Nucleic acid binder design. Structure first.
Lengths: 141, 206, 82, 63, 100, 143, 145
RNA sequence: UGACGGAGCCAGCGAGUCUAACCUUGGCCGAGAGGUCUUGGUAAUCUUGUGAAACUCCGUCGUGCUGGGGAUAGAGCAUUGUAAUUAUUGCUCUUCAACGAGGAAUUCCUAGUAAGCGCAAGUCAUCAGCUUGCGUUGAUUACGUCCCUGCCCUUUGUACACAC
RNA sequence: UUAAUUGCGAUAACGAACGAGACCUUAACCUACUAAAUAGUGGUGCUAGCAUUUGCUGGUUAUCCACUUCUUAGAGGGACUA
C-alpha cells in the first residue's frame, strides 16, 4: 500500500487518467517525458499546471498519464486537465487545505478549464446539409 | 533562483518562466498600456497567457469577446481567406514569428507595438445606410470602442493577407511590416489608408 | 468569351542562380548591415533568387556575423549580430 | 485631431432602417454637466468613451 | 462445466427481470457466480426517404432498434443443470445455454 | 540513468539511428532503391536518393520498440497517406508493400526485429539493447 | 559554407534531343521540356548518370549531358526498368521503346492513322473530333470550335 | 497560411461467412494495382487502437500558366463479370489544356456553429465527384430591425370569391 | 408578458377539448449502488533492455491477488433559472 491517487479528464472526446502516486518528481505521458508533446507550440499549454504555483509542490509526486482519443490539441487539453486534477487529488488525499484550497483557487483564477471540462460537444448532423446548421444550396429558375 | 530538478528534468528556461506570468516566454505583458482612454477595458492586456490558443466561451453572449487577450484575437483574425480555415497551430506560428520581427526590428516590446497600432488604426467616424426611400444616400455616425478594436484588427489582417498574395514576402514579415507601419502612423499602411478613406467619407457626408 | 480580369505579371528580373564573384564581395559587405535579415529580405533588396539565400543564410549562420535569434519552419529570423 | 472624450450614461434605443445605429445619451468627461445625444454603430452598453471628432451636432432618428 | 446464460432482446424491462430471476436463483443455494455483464447496445439504423415517390422536399427518416445483450456466468456441477435449465422465459427475450 | 527510446524526441533519434546506419552499411541495400515511389499515392520518389532506406529502417525499428506485433499491411497503412486523384478528392492509399517487406526482412538479417507468436514481428533482444544504447548516445551528444 | 563561385562555364540555354532546354533551373526539371520526358523519367535519367542532382542546367559539364543524352535514346540498355517507358510492346515489333521529342508527336499520328484506316470506333471519333474515352459531351467540351 | 519528399502521427459512428463463401489478420511474391498460402471472427471479443486525413517538425523549391493545376490523350500491367468496344474501375510512364480571386445577380450561417479535413453506412459482382451519419481542426461577425423578401393577430377599405 | 391564445389580468360569458407545452430518445454530470478477462486498472510471480546506487521503459493468461477512476451499461440522483 504505497500512496497514490487517480483522476480523469476530457476535452472533446479524449480521456486522460493520472495515477499520481508518491515519487521523486516524474511527469510522463504514454511513457514519454512531459517535455515531448507534439504540437511543440502548446508545450507551454501542457506546461501550465507545472508553472502557475511553482515546482516545489511537484517534487514529491510522480504523475503518469495515459491518453486516448481526440486530436493532438484535444490530447494536450486532456493532459493538462488530468495533471491539474491529479495535483489536487494528491492534495485531496494527503495534504492540508491551505495547500489545496489556494492550489484549487489559483488554478481556476487563471482559467476554469484546468478543472472544469469543456461542456460543448459536437451536435448531430441534420438532413438537408453537410452539417447541423448548414444546408444545401437551393435555387430557383 | 529556484534550481529544483525533478526526476524528469525540465530546461532552466521553463523554470525561468515560473518567475513572471507566462510572458509568451520572452515578451512583457506589463508596462504595456493602451494610449487611448476610449479603448480601455476593451483591449485585454492585463491577463497573461503562455499561448494564444484557448477554447474560450466568448461568442455565447454579447461582451465576453472583450474579455479576450488581444494577441489571441490577432491569431483568430489571421485565420481567414477560405482554405486557411482552422489550423490554429499555424496561426500562432506566424504570430510568434511576426511578433519576433517586431522585436528584431523597432526594438521595443512587441505587445506594446500591437496595442498602439490597433488604437491608431481604429476608425473614429463612419457612414451608414439611410437610403430610406430614394435610390441611395449616406450619413455619418460614430463608432463604438468595441467596434473600433474589431475594425482595427480586421483591417490589419486583411491588409497583410492581401499584400502577401502572390508575393515572395511571407505572411510573417508582411504582418510585421503592416503592424510596425501602422504603429508609427505612416501612410504606406493599408489599414491607415483605409481609416483615412472611411473618416474622409464620413466627414464629407456629415 | 469575356473574362473581366487582367492577365499579366510584371517583368521577371531573373538573377543569380549560381553565386558569382562580383556579388560575393557584395554579400560579405552588405548583409552585416541588416538589422533584420531573412530569406525574403535579401531576395528583395539584394536581389537574390531562390536557392541562393538558403545557402547564404546557412553561410553566415555557420561562419560568422548574423546569429540564430529564431530559425524555424519556413522562417529564418536573424539579426545584425555584432 | 481635436476630439472630445464622452462617456454615456443612458442608451435610448437602436434606430435606423436596418437597426445598425443606436441612440445614446452621452456626457463629456471634460467640461462635464453638458449632455448630448449621439449615434453609435457598434455595440455600446454603458461607460463607453467614444471618440467624438466633432462634438456639436444634435442627433435624431435616422430613416 | 462453464455454463453461460446469454440473453438478447429489444425490451429492457423484460430482459432485466429475467436476469434478476436468474441472478436471484443463483444467489440462492450457494452458486458462486459472476454478475450481469453489460455489453454495449447494438443500435441498428436504416435511413430511408419518407416519400414513396420522388416528389417532395428531402426529408429522411431513421428507424432504429436497440439490442441489449447481457450474459450470466455460472460455475457448478450437474446438480444445477437440472435446475438452471428450467427456463424463466418471458415473451421477447431468448436464452442460449453454453457450457465451456 | 534510465533513459530509453521513449526518453528521446522522434526527429533526433531517427536521424541519429540513420547516422548509426550509414557509417557502416551492414544491414542491406536493395537493388531498386532509386526507382520506388514508396506508394501508389506518392507522385515522386524520395529526394534522399543515397539513403532513405536506413531512415525508414530507423523509423520502423523505433515503431517496433513501442509496440508488440505489426504487419506489412500495418506498415503500409501507417506509412501511406492521401492521394491526389486528379480532380477527384483525396483518398487514403496504402504504401508500397515490397518496400516495407524488404526493410522488415533486413531488420531480421541484422538481428533487430524477429517474428513473434500470434503473428507479426517483434523487437529483438539484441535489437532492444542496441536501440536503447542509441538513446543513451543521442542525449549525451547534445550534452 | 556550401558556397562556390562561377568562372564562365555557365550556359543560359541548352539544346538536347533537338529541342530547347532552358537553363537557370535544376537539371532534374530542366529536362522536362523535352517532349516525352516527365519528372520521374528525368529523375531516373539523372540518377543513373550521376550528375549531382542539385546542379543547375547551365552549370553542367558537357561530359555529363552526352551521358544523359545516350540514356534518353537507349534506356533499356542502362538497367532502366522495362515498365518505365511510354511506348511498351510496340505494335510494329514488340520491343520496349521510348519515343523522344520529335518521336512522341510523330508516332502519335501514326497510331491514330492506323486506327483510322482500320475504321475502328476510336479512329473515326478521333477524325470527328469528339471524345474517344467515353466521356459525356452533352454539357462538357463546348469551347472547341 | 504553398506544393513536393521525409518523420511525428491522434478519432468517432458503423458493418462483416453456414451450408455460404463476407470482413480479412499474418507470412511470401510483385514499383504498383494485385496475386499467393493460411489465420481470427456469427462479433465490445477477429477484421480494428480502423496507426484516416486535414494537421505539426526537418528538408527540396521559388513568385516563375513554374516543382501551381491535372483536363485532354498515347502505350502497357491487373482486378470484377457469360460479356467490357462509345476506355467499369485500379496501377505505371508519357502529353501538360483552360484557370492569375471571377460581371450583372444569388445561396447558407449566431456556436463546437460556419468553414477546412477524412472516415463509416446506403445503392454494390466491380465503379463516388452523390446521399445519410460520424468524428478531427476550428474564425471573424450580431444579442438588433421590418428597410428588402415572407408570416401571425387586430382595426380599416373593397366593384375580389377559380379569392391582386 | 411569452418561442407559443404561453400566462397575469380584464371581461355576456361559464366550463372545456385539440395543438403548443407536457412527453420520448440522444448528447453532456455522477470518483454514490449493482457488477464485469467478450472493457480495463493496480498489485504478486516469470522474463527483457538501459543504468546499476535507490529507478525507469517493457513483454507475459492459467502467474495469481485486489479495485471499478477511466471503458460499458441497468436501477437512480442532479437543473427548478436557485
Amino acid at each position: 500500500a504505497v500512496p497514490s491517487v487517480q483522476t480523469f479528464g476530457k476535452k472533446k472526446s479524449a480521456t486522460a487518467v493520472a495515477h499520481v502516486k508518491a515519487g521523486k518528481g516524474l511527469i510522463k505521458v504514454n511513457g514519454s517525458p512531459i517535455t515531448l508533446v507534439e504540437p511543440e507550440i502548446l508545450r507551454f499549454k501542457v506546461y501550465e499546471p507545472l508553472l502557475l504555483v511553482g515546482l516545489d509542490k511537484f517534487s514529491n509526486i510522480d504523475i503518469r498519464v495515459r491518453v486516448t482519443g481526440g486530436g493532438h490539441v484535444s490530447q494536450v487539453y486532456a493532459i493538462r486537465q488530468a495533471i491539474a486534477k491529479g495535483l489536487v487529488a494528491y492534495h485531496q488525499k494527503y495534504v492540508d487545505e491551505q495547500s489545496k484550497n489556494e492550489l484549487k483557487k489559483a488554478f481556476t483564477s487563471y482559467d476554469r478549464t484546468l478543472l472544469i471540462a469543456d461542456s460543448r460537444r459536437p451536435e448531430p448532423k441534420k438532413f438537408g446539409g453537410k452539417g447541423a446548421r448548414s444546408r444545401f444550396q437551393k435555387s430557383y429558375r | 533562483f529556484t534550481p529544483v530538478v525533478l526526476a524528469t528534468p525540465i530546461p532552466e528556461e521553463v523554470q525561468q518562466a515560473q518567475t513572471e506570468i507566462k510572458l509568451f516566454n520572452k515578451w512583457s505583458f506589463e508596462e504595456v498600456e493602451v494610449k487611448d482612454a476610449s479603448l480601455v477595458d476593451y483591449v485585454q492586456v492585463r491577463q497573461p497567457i503562455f499561448v494564444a490558443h484557448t477554447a474560450g466561451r466568448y461568442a455565447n453572449k454579447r461582451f465576453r469577446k472583450a474579455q479576450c487577450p488581444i494577441i489571441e484575437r490577432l491569431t483568430n483574425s489571421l485565420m481567414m481567406n477560405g482554405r486557411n480555415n482552422g489550423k490554429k497551430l499555424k496561426a500562432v506560428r506566424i504570430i510568434k514569428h511576426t511578433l519576433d520581427i517586431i522585436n528584431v526590428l523597432t526594438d521595443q516590446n512587441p505587445i506594446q507595438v500591437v496595442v498602439d497600432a490597433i488604437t491608431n488604426t481604429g476608425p473614429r467616424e463612419d457612414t451608414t445606410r439611410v437610403g430610406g426611400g430614394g435610390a441611395a444616400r449616406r450619413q455619418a455616425v460614430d463608432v463604438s470602442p468595441l467596434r473600433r478594436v474589431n475594425q482595427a484588427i480586421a483591417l490589419l489582417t486583411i491588409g497583410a493577407r492581401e499584400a502577401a498574395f502572390r508575393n515572395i514576402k511571407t505572411i510573417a514579415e508582411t504582418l510585421a511590416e503592416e503592424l510596425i507601419n501602422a504603429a508609427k502612423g505612416s501612410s504606406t499602411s493599408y489599414a491607415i489608408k483605409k481609416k483615412d478613406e472611411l473618416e474622409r467619407v464620413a466627414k464629407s457626408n456629415r | 468569351k469575356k473574362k473581366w480580369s487582367k492577365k499579366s505579371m510584371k517583368d521577371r528580373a531573373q538573377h543569380a542562380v549560381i553565386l558569382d564573384q562580383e556579388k560575393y564581395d557584395r554579400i560579405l559587405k552588405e548583409v552585416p548591415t541588416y538589422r533584420y535579415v531573412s530569406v525574403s529580405v535579401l531576395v528583395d533588396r539584394l536581389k537574390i533568387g531562390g536557392s541562393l539565400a538558403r545557402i547564404a543564410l546557412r553561410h553566415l549562420e555557420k561562419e560568422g556575423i548574423i546569429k540564430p535569434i529564431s530559425k524555424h519552419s519556413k522562417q529564418a529570423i536573424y539579426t545584425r549580430a555584432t | 485631431t481635436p476630439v472630445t472624450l464622452a462617456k454615456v450614461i443612458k442608451v435610448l434605443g437602436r434606430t435606423g432602417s436596418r437597426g445598425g445605429v443606436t441612440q445614446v445619451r452621452v456626457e463629456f468627461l471634460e467640461d462635464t454637466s453638458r449632455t448630448i445625444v449621439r449615434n453609435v454603430k457598434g455595440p455600446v452598453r454603458e461607460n463607453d468613451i467614444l471618440v467624438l471628432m466633432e462634438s456639436e451636432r444634435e442627433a435624431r432618428r435616422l430613416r | 462445466i462453464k455454463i453461460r446464460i446469454t440473453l438478447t432482446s429489444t425490451k429492457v424491462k423484460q430482459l432485466e427481470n429475467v436476469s434478476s430471476n436468474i441472478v436471484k436463483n443463483a444467489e440462492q443455494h450457494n452458486l458462486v457466480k459472476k454478475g450481469p455483464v453489460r455489453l454495449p447496445t447494438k443500435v441498428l439504423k436504416i435511413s430511408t426517404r419518407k416519400t414513396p415517390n420522388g416528389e417532395g422536399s428531402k426529408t429522411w427518416e431513421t428507424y432504429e432498434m436497440r439490442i441489449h445483450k447481457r450474459y450470466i456466468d455460472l460455475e457448478a456441477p450437474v446438480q444445477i443443470v437440472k435446475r438452471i435449465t428450467q427456463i424463466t422465459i418471458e415473451p421477447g427475450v431468448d436464452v442460449e445455454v453454453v457450457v465451456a | 540513468p534510465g533513459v530509453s527510446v521513449r526518453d528521446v524526441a522522434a526527429q533526433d533519434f531517427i536521424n541519429a539511428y540513420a547516422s548509426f546506419l550509414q557509417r557502416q552499411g551492414k544491414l542491406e541495400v536493395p537493388g531498386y532503391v532509386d526507382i520506388v515511389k514508396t506508394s501508389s499515392g506518392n507522385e515522386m520518389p524520395p529526394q534522399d536518393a543515397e539513403g532513405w532506406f536506413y531512415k525508414r529502417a530507423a523509423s520502423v525499428a523505433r515503431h517496433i520498440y513501442m509496440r508488440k506485433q505489426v504487419g506489412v499491411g500495418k506498415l503500409n497503412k501507417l506509412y501511406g497517406g492521401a492521394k491526389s486523384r486528379g480532380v477527384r478528392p483525396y483518398k487514403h492509399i496504402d504504401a508500397s508493400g515490397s518496400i516495407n517487406r524488404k526493410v522488415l526482412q533486413a531488420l531480421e538479417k541484422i538481428g533487430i526485429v524477429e517474428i513473434s507468436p500470434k503473428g507479426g514481428r517483434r523487437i529483438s533482444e539484441n535489437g532492444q539493447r542496441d536501440l536503447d544504447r542509441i538513446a543513451a548516445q543521442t542525449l549525451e551528444e547534445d550534452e | 559554407s556550401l558556397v562556390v563561385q562561377e568562372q564562365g562555364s555557365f550556359q543560359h540555354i541548352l539544346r538536347l534531343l533537338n529541342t530547347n532546354v532552358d537553363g537557370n533551373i535544376k537539371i532534374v526539371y530542366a529536362l522536362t521540356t523535352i517532349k516525352g520526358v516527365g519528372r520521374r523519367y528525368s529523375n531516373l535519367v539523372c540518377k543513373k548518370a550521376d550528375v549531382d542532382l542539385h546542379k543547375r542546367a547551365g552549370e553542367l559539364t558537357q561530359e555529363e549531358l552526352e551521358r544523359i543524352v545516350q540514356i534518353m535514346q537507349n534506356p533499356t540498355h542502362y538497367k532502366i526498368p522495362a515498365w518505365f517507358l511510354n511506348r511498351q510492346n510496340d505494335i510494329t515489333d514488340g520491343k520496349d521503346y521510348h519515343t523522344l521529342a520529335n518521336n512522341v508527336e510523330s508516332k502519335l499520328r501514326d497510331d491514330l492513322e492506323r486506327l483510322k484506316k482500320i475504321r475502328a470506333h476510336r479512329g473515326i471519333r478521333h477524325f470527328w473530333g469528339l471524345r474517344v474515352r467515353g466521356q459525356h459531351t452533352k454539357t462538357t467540351g463546348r469551347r472547341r470550335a
